[PDB]
Amino acid sequence: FRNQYDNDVTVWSPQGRIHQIEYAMEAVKQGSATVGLKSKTHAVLVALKRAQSELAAHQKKILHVDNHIGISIAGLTADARLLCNFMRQECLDSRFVFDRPLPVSRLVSLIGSKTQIPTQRYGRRPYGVGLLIAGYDDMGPHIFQTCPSANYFDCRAMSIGARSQSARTYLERHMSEFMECNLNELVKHGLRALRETLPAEQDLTTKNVSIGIVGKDLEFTIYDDDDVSPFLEGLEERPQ
Template sequence: MFRNQYDTDVTTWSPAGRLFQVEYAMEAVKQGSAAVGLRSRTHVVLAAVNKAASDLSSHQRKVFKVDDHVGVAIAGLTADGRVLSRYLRNECINHSFVYEAPLPVGRLVVRLADKAQVCTQRSWKRPYGVGLLVAGLDESGAHLYYNCPSGNYFEYQAFAIGSRSQAAKTYLERRFESFDKYSSEELIKDALFAIKETLQGEKLTSSICTVAIVGVGEPFHIIDQQAVQEMIEAIEAREEAPAEPAEPAEPAGDIQDEGNQDAAPMEI
């Protein structure tokens, strides 16, 4: 059986200049269940698919609260996601204890990226096989970041990661320009629409997805399943509602100008 001789450890470069262990970690994110993030000026919404692996088991959590102003959604190895979310919690607690103020979201994301990057340059470590969507609110406004296993991080208006996330990205790319003016309810509805795109025909219910929100005057929290289900039913009812029939146009022959009945026809 063929074995790649350049993936024995993370510090072995291939002749093409690639680190296969890092690419494998990024592939693990693509194979994980989908997660979506949307941002307006005042709110950030996270939504994730959390289907159970078996009818006899419960699902694994995909959305974690870090602090009152920060939360994360993950795609990839859930165990790595729990480790990193605990690291983020400790960073927020330590900063709050020392400075008596919440840790800015951008600074927290940089620390997470540095921690992930160290794992790409030590032969006795492996990259974290999980991608994180970090949603937060600080003095500079609402923020949505994506942290990659390679140590890169990017800020987005809206983004999707995980399995079949391209369908959600296509939906978000058509609508992201209006997200700045959205209310929290509109953001949640668009997040559910994007999650529905990743299911490829499977029925969306509150039991297979988790939605969380953080915003001005609203600490990070996971929305109740019953409220999510009501929003899903409202979306489905709107989609199934028949379109109103258009009024029939009056025939042109019945409309005559009484003053010009004897006028010659127009030349075309």
């Protein structure tokens, strides 16, 4: 087997790749799609909730870590949850020692440092969770996407997960309004993005969508079926 080079993260391919890292990268492609948008003063995280069966609740994909910073997970439940407790502990430690919120860029930098150790050292499996980070700090809203290759990017938007290329090309079609949009406009743009991800037979129902919005004065608040109801009342109809 020529793929004896993908059994641990500590071996390189003959062509200079770490195939285990690439498999971890592709792992988050399995999870459900999730797209985020940010305005002049407001950043939104909208995700597509999934359920094991219709007789049970949908899997939460938007996680609250601190009043100003919020995360969205796509990938392994275990790794994402561990990253979430790590995020909460670090945000609290920052609030305790500096009395200031953890910067989005600094938080994502420590996330990268934490998740690089499994990539570099034998032992812990690489953190195979795609994280969408949306928060607020001195220069306004930020959207940070932390790829499971222990890499992160400052993005205007990103959709990570299953069939996320459709949302990616939707946002590629629709940059020109993201910067100047208000809450409702950006929310409807994100909903159209997920609807692009979602196939024809399915639609963004109340139980299907999860919306998280942060801003300058508005904390990272996550909406649910009853809470997403006013935001989806302004939503248009699917252009089918």
